[PDB]
Amino acid sequence: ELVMTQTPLSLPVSLGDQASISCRSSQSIVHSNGNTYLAWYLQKPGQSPKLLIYKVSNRFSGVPDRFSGSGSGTDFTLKINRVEAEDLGVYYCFQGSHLPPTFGGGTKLEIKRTVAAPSVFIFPPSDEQLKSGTASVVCLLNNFYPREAKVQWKVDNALQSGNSQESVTEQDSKDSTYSLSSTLTLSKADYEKHKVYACEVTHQGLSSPVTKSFNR
Amino acid sequence: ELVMTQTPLSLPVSLGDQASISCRSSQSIVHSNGNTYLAWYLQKPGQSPKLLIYKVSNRFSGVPDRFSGSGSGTDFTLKINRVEAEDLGVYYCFQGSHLPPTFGGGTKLEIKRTVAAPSVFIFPPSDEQLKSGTASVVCLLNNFYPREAKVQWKVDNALQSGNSQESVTEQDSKDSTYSLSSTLTLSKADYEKHKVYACEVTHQGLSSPVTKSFNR
Amino acid sequence: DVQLLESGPGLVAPSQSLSITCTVSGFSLTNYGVDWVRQPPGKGLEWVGVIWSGGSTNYNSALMSRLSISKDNSKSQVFLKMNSLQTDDTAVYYCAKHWGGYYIPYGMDHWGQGTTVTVSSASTKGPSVFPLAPSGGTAALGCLVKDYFPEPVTVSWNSGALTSGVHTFPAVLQSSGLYSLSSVVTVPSSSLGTQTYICNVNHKPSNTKVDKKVEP
Amino acid sequence: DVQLLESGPGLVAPSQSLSITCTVSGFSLTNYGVDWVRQPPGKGLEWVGVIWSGGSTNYNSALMSRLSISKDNSKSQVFLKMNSLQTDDTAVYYCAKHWGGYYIPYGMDHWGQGTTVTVSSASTKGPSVFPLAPGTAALGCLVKDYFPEPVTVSWNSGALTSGVHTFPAVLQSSGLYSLSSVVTVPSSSLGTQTYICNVNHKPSNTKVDKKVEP
Ligand SMILES: Nc1nc2ccc(NC(=O)CCCC(=O)O)cc2[nH]1
């Protein structure tokens, strides 16, 4: 059985720069009929995979000329010229010359754009939820770059720990930014034992750490 | 970051033949100080990994000379001469020249020996279990080769399906055989409705299917 | 116009069997092969198997003892079955149509949406949905979708009418073994008084449909 | 003489933290580096990180934002901690001592037995143990309905080693595990010789010694 090896696993590229991805096979994927059945697929966030390239170097209908496939035998390469926001996602190579066919591990294209500070918002538990016996406080960090962001919860000015979870979105296809939500969860009892709930946010696009808060 | 590619995934070898395992690095693992930090580990069934080779080709104390490492730059090979029963398990390469160090995926060494038929045994549910409401019926196939075996349950000559589960041991380090259990789980009420319980076995080493059974 | 859609049961117990149907439109299964591909959470795409136009199949090495693919050309359906489900088998399962070539496809041109299979002994649960009640000329509002199992939920706004400004976060598994996420949307502050915002949450595995008005 | 032993909590709930202690003997942590390596069920070995003799550390790319390795040289102890655990993190976690070389080890020469971590919201459950009743005779124990892994099985306190086969456990639709352990013995022994399987399930702190009679 063949092994398809793709590097790098993750590939930070600046808008408008070129991207080069490697895909190697453990043996020749040249068929005895003389063709080499190697395809490249792109899977964008929240999408199913799409066919970019077939037979080493042939563009699938509707695939821009910025994308090109080359190589022979065991060593193949995808090149993307003038990378754009929309090119983001995980690329895979796929060998179909020999049974069983296999995908490579994938290479994740991450876009490097200019710094963007988050817009920060905080939300108190809804009344409904409180009357169900639990309090979710949410902090939202909208459309920022880079992904690295620090979020600290403070309850009556005491820094919290172990009582919250974060979710970050996939990088955005239109402007190459992230959004993050940290949710702080508490029993109603604990929630009502306190007054000021604040979310303190550190990010490279902010001048000092920004805090958003409310009094319960 | 480096990728270590090991092939094959699985390597069936005959007792006394040679085994050859490949380990490929996506970039050179020659350090700037001039050493190449590539080691090989064997992990035997139910054991922790053990170091065989370090710095490409140096045997660890106590490792027999049937084992040797060779190679350079990106392409490395472990050769095992005169494979023995005890050499069974999963071999892994390991690159230490570059941060972060990485294991390959592993190559599983399967030993190929002469045909051996299973000794078949059947066990009724214990009384203790019956008095709890469930009836487990166990069929055991002991010390056979090859691994492919067919176990069928029949209840009053009625072929069963989807009410039983198999477990197979790892290959044996002294005799290169497998053992296998098949458990037929039944509610107490469904058990007591029937009389004859039978496990029927088909194997390469058996000249016709062997049935073992009991009356409840 | 070419379509492929997966139909699955969402939640299967360990040891039990998975049955997925691909329903196909705009081409004939008599003239095209279909592949089955899968993707474990956070992990790479895996080729599972294929069913050729004439009805023959081929399978993945790792799964082929538990897999079987069949079809009904007359009904434009293709079936994947798989027994003895493991935790490992939790994945998004895609069917993809073959395109190009003679006896080996040049690629997979059209894919279904994927259907999500979680392998687990836990029981289905529909979400509780709470409002997130509402920057400079801009307002964030959203919905907290809490305590549901298994994935996915679908979230929309104003029955799909409101598309721009939406961020539906990846789910996070809580210590309770239940999932939670939040969908947010940025709106004009000048609209809050005249426009109503209802978030539409759909959890198919539990057959639950919840519409929550998010008021100031 | 060199020994490494991992001590873990067996079952951690999703989103929560792991803390495993490696206790070491026969060498000084002031002189050697130790690695952490892990193995998801059925899967390959993954290097997790290291803590060098001097106290610096390095980490796995995939885990490094949730990982921290520290140690107490005087107590011969190394700690691994990891936060925000996912199902993914279910694995056997080994510590291994560094051997050879100057600033880069030639290899890892001694390893601990490994400790098993299941990331799950379910609760601990001990096994029910039932006999499998017997010139060669098979007898065994059925060890059923336990969560999480592992269980250990021995016969006659470990006196009886030969002809033993303890089977890989299977997960049942109930979300509980089950295995059997069997032993082949002389039929002439069945009247004179006693046969007890000793089952130990450390997550539920349960221990069952069952006597298997004809
Ligand atoms: N989307 C795809 N599904 C498949 C399935 C199988 C493919 N290749 C082969 O079967 C190779 C056959 C080699 C031979 O000619 O014997 C290729 C392929 N591509």
Ligand SMILES: Nc1nc2ccc(NC(=O)CCCC(=O)O)cc2[nH]1
């Ligand atoms: N068992 C092992 N654990 C480790 C950890 C790190 C290893 N290699 C390096 O740190 C290379 C550093 C390269 C340099 O900076 O000189 C090598 C290694 N082997």
